Design a protein around this motif. Structure first.
Motif, mmCIF file in Angstrom:
data_model
loop_
_atom_site.group_PDB
_atom_site.id
_atom_site.type_symbol
_atom_site.label_atom_id
_atom_site.label_comp_id
_atom_site.label_asym_id
_atom_site.label_seq_id
_atom_site.Cartn_x
_atom_site.Cartn_y
_atom_site.Cartn_z
ATOM 1 N N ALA A 1 5.760 -3.902 -5.747
ATOM 2 C CA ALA A 1 5.262 -4.932 -4.850
ATOM 3 C C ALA A 1 4.666 -6.089 -5.648
ATOM 4 O O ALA A 1 3.784 -5.892 -6.489
ATOM 5 N N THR A 2 5.151 -7.295 -5.378
ATOM 6 C CA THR A 2 4.667 -8.498 -6.053
ATOM 7 C C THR A 2 4.760 -9.642 -5.059
ATOM 8 O O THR A 2 5.518 -9.554 -4.083
ATOM 9 N N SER A 3 3.985 -10.699 -5.280
ATOM 10 C CA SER A 3 4.034 -11.829 -4.373
ATOM 11 C C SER A 3 5.057 -12.774 -4.978
ATOM 12 O O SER A 3 5.498 -13.746 -4.351
ATOM 13 N N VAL A 4 5.440 -12.462 -6.209
ATOM 14 C CA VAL A 4 6.423 -13.240 -6.933
ATOM 15 C C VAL A 4 7.778 -12.568 -6.678
ATOM 16 O O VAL A 4 7.861 -11.352 -6.584
ATOM 17 N N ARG A 5 8.843 -13.350 -6.566
ATOM 18 C CA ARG A 5 10.153 -12.781 -6.238
ATOM 19 C C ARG A 5 11.237 -12.683 -7.305
ATOM 20 O O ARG A 5 12.213 -11.952 -7.117
ATOM 21 N N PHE A 6 11.092 -13.388 -8.423
ATOM 22 C CA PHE A 6 12.155 -13.352 -9.432
ATOM 23 C C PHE A 6 11.827 -12.764 -10.791
ATOM 24 O O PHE A 6 10.685 -12.816 -11.256
ATOM 25 N N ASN B 1 0.723 -1.264 0.000
ATOM 26 C CA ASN B 1 0.000 0.000 0.000
ATOM 27 C C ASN B 1 0.753 1.315 0.000
ATOM 28 O O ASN B 1 0.131 2.382 -0.103
ATOM 29 N N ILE B 2 2.074 1.265 0.117
ATOM 30 C CA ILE B 2 2.842 2.503 0.131
ATOM 31 C C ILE B 2 2.748 3.136 -1.262
ATOM 32 O O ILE B 2 2.827 2.444 -2.286
ATOM 33 N N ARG B 3 2.534 4.448 -1.304
ATOM 34 C CA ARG B 3 2.381 5.145 -2.578
ATOM 35 C C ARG B 3 3.425 6.221 -2.808
ATOM 36 O O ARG B 3 3.629 6.678 -3.934
ATOM 37 N N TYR B 4 4.076 6.634 -1.730
ATOM 38 C CA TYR B 4 5.112 7.655 -1.786
ATOM 39 C C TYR B 4 6.259 7.243 -0.892
ATOM 40 O O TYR B 4 6.081 6.937 0.279
ATOM 41 N N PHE B 5 7.445 7.233 -1.477
ATOM 42 C CA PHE B 5 8.674 6.859 -0.792
ATOM 43 C C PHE B 5 9.492 8.136 -0.595
ATOM 44 O O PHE B 5 9.296 9.103 -1.338
ATOM 45 N N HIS B 6 10.410 8.144 0.379
ATOM 46 C CA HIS B 6 11.218 9.340 0.654
ATOM 47 C C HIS B 6 10.247 10.471 0.940
ATOM 48 O O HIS B 6 10.397 11.565 0.390
ATOM 49 N N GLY B 7 9.255 10.231 1.787
ATOM 50 C CA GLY B 7 8.285 11.280 2.017
ATOM 51 C C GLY B 7 7.582 11.475 0.679
ATOM 52 O O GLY B 7 7.087 10.513 0.107
ATOM 53 N N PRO B 8 7.547 12.699 0.141
ATOM 54 C CA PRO B 8 6.902 13.022 -1.144
ATOM 55 C C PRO B 8 7.731 12.671 -2.383
ATOM 56 O O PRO B 8 7.196 12.356 -3.442
ATOM 57 N N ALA B 9 9.046 12.759 -2.235
ATOM 58 C CA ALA B 9 10.005 12.535 -3.312
ATOM 59 C C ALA B 9 9.718 11.500 -4.406
ATOM 60 O O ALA B 9 9.697 11.842 -5.576
ATOM 61 N N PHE B 10 9.498 10.242 -4.049
ATOM 62 C CA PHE B 10 9.288 9.216 -5.069
ATOM 63 C C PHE B 10 7.901 8.602 -5.019
ATOM 64 O O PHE B 10 7.445 8.179 -3.953
ATOM 65 N N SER B 11 7.224 8.545 -6.162
ATOM 66 C CA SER B 11 5.892 7.962 -6.194
ATOM 67 C C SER B 11 5.958 6.490 -6.608
ATOM 68 O O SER B 11 6.534 6.145 -7.639
ATOM 69 N N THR B 12 5.378 5.621 -5.789
ATOM 70 C CA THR B 12 5.363 4.193 -6.081
ATOM 71 C C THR B 12 3.929 3.767 -6.390
ATOM 72 O O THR B 12 3.176 3.366 -5.500
ATOM 73 N N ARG C 1 2.839 1.225 -7.525
ATOM 74 C CA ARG C 1 2.578 -0.155 -7.163
ATOM 75 C C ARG C 1 3.251 -0.642 -5.891
ATOM 76 O O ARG C 1 3.528 -1.836 -5.752
ATOM 77 N N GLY C 2 3.494 0.276 -4.959
ATOM 78 C CA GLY C 2 4.148 -0.067 -3.707
ATOM 79 C C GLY C 2 5.601 -0.439 -3.896
ATOM 80 O O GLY C 2 6.234 -0.038 -4.875
ATOM 81 N N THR C 3 6.140 -1.210 -2.959
ATOM 82 C CA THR C 3 7.525 -1.653 -3.065
ATOM 83 C C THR C 3 7.765 -2.795 -2.089
ATOM 84 O O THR C 3 6.816 -3.301 -1.484
ATOM 85 N N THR C 4 9.013 -3.242 -1.982
ATOM 86 C CA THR C 4 9.350 -4.301 -1.036
ATOM 87 C C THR C 4 10.637 -3.885 -0.336
ATOM 88 O O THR C 4 11.360 -3.005 -0.822
ATOM 89 N N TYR C 5 10.902 -4.497 0.814
ATOM 90 C CA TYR C 5 12.127 -4.239 1.568
ATOM 91 C C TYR C 5 12.792 -5.609 1.629
ATOM 92 O O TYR C 5 12.374 -6.472 2.400
ATOM 93 N N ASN C 6 13.798 -5.819 0.788
ATOM 94 C CA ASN C 6 14.472 -7.107 0.729
ATOM 95 C C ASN C 6 15.607 -7.256 1.722
ATOM 96 O O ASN C 6 16.475 -6.390 1.837
ATOM 97 N N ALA C 7 15.594 -8.382 2.423
ATOM 98 C CA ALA C 7 16.601 -8.719 3.417
ATOM 99 C C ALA C 7 16.937 -10.188 3.144
ATOM 100 O O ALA C 7 16.042 -10.983 2.826
ATOM 101 N N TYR C 8 18.207 -10.560 3.278
ATOM 102 C CA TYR C 8 18.614 -11.935 2.988
ATOM 103 C C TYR C 8 19.278 -12.668 4.133
ATOM 104 O O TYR C 8 20.107 -12.103 4.854
ATOM 105 N N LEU C 9 18.908 -13.933 4.289
ATOM 106 C CA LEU C 9 19.468 -14.763 5.342
ATOM 107 C C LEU C 9 20.363 -15.843 4.759
ATOM 108 O O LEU C 9 19.893 -16.707 4.018
ATOM 109 N N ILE C 10 21.651 -15.792 5.086
ATOM 110 C CA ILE C 10 22.587 -16.802 4.610
ATOM 111 C C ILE C 10 22.912 -17.750 5.773
ATOM 112 O O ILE C 10 23.558 -17.359 6.746
ATOM 113 N N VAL C 11 22.433 -18.988 5.663
ATOM 114 C CA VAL C 11 22.642 -20.018 6.679
ATOM 115 C C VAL C 11 23.904 -20.831 6.421
ATOM 116 O O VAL C 11 24.151 -21.291 5.304
ATOM 117 N N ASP C 12 24.696 -21.014 7.473
ATOM 118 C CA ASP C 12 25.939 -21.777 7.388
ATOM 119 C C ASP C 12 26.420 -22.112 8.802
ATOM 120 O O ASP C 12 25.661 -21.950 9.758
#
Ligand SMILES: Cc1cc2nc3c(=O)[nH]c(=O)nc-3n(C[C@H](O)[C@H](O)[C@H](O)COP(=O)(O)O)c2cc1C
Ligand SMILES: Cc1cc2nc3c(=O)[nH]c(=O)nc-3n(C[C@H](O)[C@H](O)[C@H](O)COP(=O)(O)O)c2cc1C
Ligand SMILES: [Zn+2]
Ligand SMILES: [Zn+2]
Ligand SMILES: [Zn+2]
Ligand SMILES: [Zn+2]
Ligand SMILES: [Zn+2]
Ligand SMILES: [Zn+2]
Ligand SMILES: [Zn+2]
Ligand SMILES: [Zn+2]
Lengths: 398, 398
Positions: free
Chosen positions: A173-178, A19-30, A32-43
């Motif tokens: 924003a998508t439910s698909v990742r690649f 649901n986010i429509r504006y990023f950086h406050g007003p600066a960038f219009s999204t 279609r929303g966006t995602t915040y990607n974080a990665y977990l490397i297990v070892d």
């Protein structure tokens, strides 16, 4: 809700912000929303690369727990400290106080500034340093101003996986990742809007960094940015794209942004357009009070010409035109030709401001004293505009 | 559809524009539309004062015909040539080619420029000239820059009726025509929005003009503007209001306009506000990306202090803040104290631009080097802002 495997031991554990429509406050219009990607490397030792925008920390933690519950976390890589990536830092650090922070110097300073009531073990990293996790390891590449002074990329040699953070990302924003689960044209268009509004000012640093990675001869099999889709099927496309956009050669295209109160400036905008089209040039015409500034900037990335028009009100330009101008000055479009134009009723005033701001944006005016008309255009006025568009077309040649 | 009698022989024959939401192209927002007022004075010789916005010419003509059909028209007064008043000029002139145009010199020039394939009998009028219609007559008062170089007021001595054109008008659409059929507070608020966004730059001319009318000792029993409601019950209120607004004394009020990306500039805006309220000042706080620029300007009319804040992006100010600044420079607020403020991450840049533009608007900074914070505010940073708001309050005193 569920983490997504990029490959065994490496998971996407970010959050999707529909649901986010504006990023950086007003600066960038999204749109279609966006995602915040974080990665977990297990070892033998597990590492988490970047966190998430604070309002989504729960999603991060919930996803972490789905991989292993008593969240382990030996290392916490912080590629960037903006807030869409470091907002859940406190929560993560509270969850694993022993986590070892791997970040740049500038990053560390920012981190102490934005949080500072939080102590943590750490090690300042530099281009080339490398930590081992067991079977896999993560080496770092400093990327100063590749958005922020603290920026840096994380590379996983064993997998040829690059984690650039913001670079190569797209706000969607998508439910698909690649990338192979999304339309090639649509995702490349989002990627262009992203680059144009955020990375345009650092195009020269982009090529340098691309070359450094080129020389070192880094094997990139997948690119996982901090926003949007993960380039797993064809990282080459996005890398070639960044190279082309940073070079700034452009395309035989011209963008005309403007506005009017009574249509005179519009009629001039139209004449200019007809000349440009006749000269064999593609044209994008934007009436600013009805267009999205970020969508206009996206078009300018490939354009070789930028024409901006406006009437004069109270000896100044029309306020709707201000945003685009101050945005161009800061974004520093590379290798662009331009022109200012507009009508006026008696003394004028907008033309000087327009040319002043266009030059501050380092855009070469194709004409000192651009087209200006008093009240309404007459036949020859429009003809002159047409010829001017034809002139710009000849220069944008191709 | 029906004309409305102001008094026998004098009718309103304008058009109501209910759906218009933006006037002057993007410049002025009309949340409730507007009207284009035109008046028909019937006598031995009938005169039409101003016409209407082209799109509504049919309404004008239809209304004229309900008074007398063959439209007679001996004189056509053109107080102002902007298009919302002279757009139906061609249609009227084609309906009565013999109509005698009464206008100023600058008006005549504008008329020949905007139309010029239209000839008409005319006579350049000056302050004091007067034409007779029989029982009644119309005298004129030149009003240069009381909006436009060609502006002028039309006065009908026999009725003490003033037809100022834009002066004293309000952009509002209603089926009711007079001030006594509308809420006093709401109509005065619309009148303020109107004055602040259009007449503010000419406040000095406003008082001079009001005094000239004062000395000549003109008897004003009713004011019929070219936009909005007709002041028939209490012209005094609106005249006293214009006098007070033009004077620029102000009120112990402060307007704070700003925006942020991550909230630091907002926390500063808040601190400044607390200081101002503590110092006994009324405060209006506007986050620009979510407020109407015209509504913000309206509040500034009465304010003695104007605080503008913004973080720095790409060494520049945030684009959403640009419109308000270029609009203040052109509107030239009279007798205002101000301050610029904002956060930054490393080099800054917004503060310079803010102060430069604020000075260009001839707004006296209560502090060169206004409050600036790096990354996030700390206790003392907010305390300092609080003290500054306290300081401005002291000066705005009252
Ligand atoms: C509120 C208003 C303020 C204006 N201020 C100025 C001014 O300061 N200087 C000028 O030369 N013209 C001024 N004009 C005239 C316009 O610049 C002129 O009408 C022009 O033809 C409109 O251009 P457009 O048809 O492209 O909107 C003003 C017009 C309006 C309606
Ligand atoms: C896209 C982006 C571009 C930026 N550019 C600059 C810059 O050129 N100079 C600077 O000093 N800070 C820059 N910053 C840092 C902000 O000015 C800083 O984070 C500030 O604290 C944000 O203020 P706010 O919390 O009031 O929104 C930038 C931040 C972002 C997100
Ligand atoms: Zn869920
Ligand atoms: Zn929350
Ligand atoms: Zn401690
Ligand atoms: Zn055409
Ligand atoms: Zn009708
Ligand atoms: Zn029509
Ligand atoms: Zn003709
Ligand atoms: Zn408070």
């Amino acid at each position: 809700s569920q983490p997504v495997a990029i490959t065994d031991g490496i998971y996407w554990v970010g959050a999707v912000d529909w649901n986010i429509r504006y990023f950086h406050g007003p600066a960038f219009s999204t749109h279609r929303g966006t995602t915040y990607n974080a990665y977990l490397i297990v070892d033998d030792k597990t590492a988490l690369v970047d966190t998430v925008y604070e309002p989504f920390k729960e999603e991060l933690i919930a996803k972490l727990k789905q991989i292993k519950d008593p969240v382990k976390l030996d290392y916490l890589v912080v590629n960037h400290t903006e807030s869409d990536h470091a907002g859940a830092f406190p929560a993560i650090m509270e969850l694993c106080p022993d986590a070892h922070v791997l970040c740049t110097q500038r990053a560390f300073d920012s981190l102490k500034a934005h949080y500072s009531h939080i102590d943590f073990n750490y090690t300042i990293v530099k281009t080339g340093t490398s930590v081992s996790l067991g079977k896999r390891s993560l080496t770092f590449i400093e990327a100063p101003m590749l958005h922020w002074p603290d920026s840096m990329f994380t590379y996983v040699p064993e997998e040829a996986l690059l984690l650039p953070n913001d670079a190569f990302g797209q706000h969607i924003a998508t439910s698909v990742r690649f990338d192979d689960q999304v339309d090639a044209g649509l995702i490349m268009d989002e990627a262009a809007k992203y680059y144009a509004n955020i990375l345009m000012p650092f195009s020269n640093l982009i090529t340098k960094k691309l070359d450094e990675i080129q020389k070192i001869n880094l094997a990139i099999k997948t690119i996982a940015p901090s926003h949007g889709i993960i380039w797993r099927k064809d990282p080459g496309r996005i890398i070639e794209a960044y190279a082309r956009w940073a070079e700034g050669q452009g395309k035989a295209k011209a963008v005309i942004a403007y506005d009017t109160m009574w249509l005179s400036t519009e009629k001039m905008a139209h004449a200019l357009m007809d000349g440009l089209v006749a000269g064999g040039c593609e044209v994008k015409l934007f009436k600013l009070s009805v267009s999205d500034r970020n969508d206009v900037i996206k078009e300018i990335l490939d354009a070789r010409a930028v024409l901006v028009g406006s009437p004069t009100i109270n000896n100044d330009i029309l306020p709707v035109v201000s945003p685009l101008l101050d945005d161009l000055v800061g974004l520093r479009p590379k290798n662009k030709v331009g022109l200012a134009f507009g009508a006026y009723g008696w003394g004028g005033g907008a033309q000087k401001i327009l040319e002043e701001r266009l030059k501050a944006a380092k855009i070469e005016l194709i004409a000192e004293p651009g087209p200006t008309v008093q009240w309404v255009p007459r036949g020859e006025d429009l003809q002159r505009c047409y010829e001017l568009g034809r002139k710009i077309a000849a220069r944008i040649a191709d």
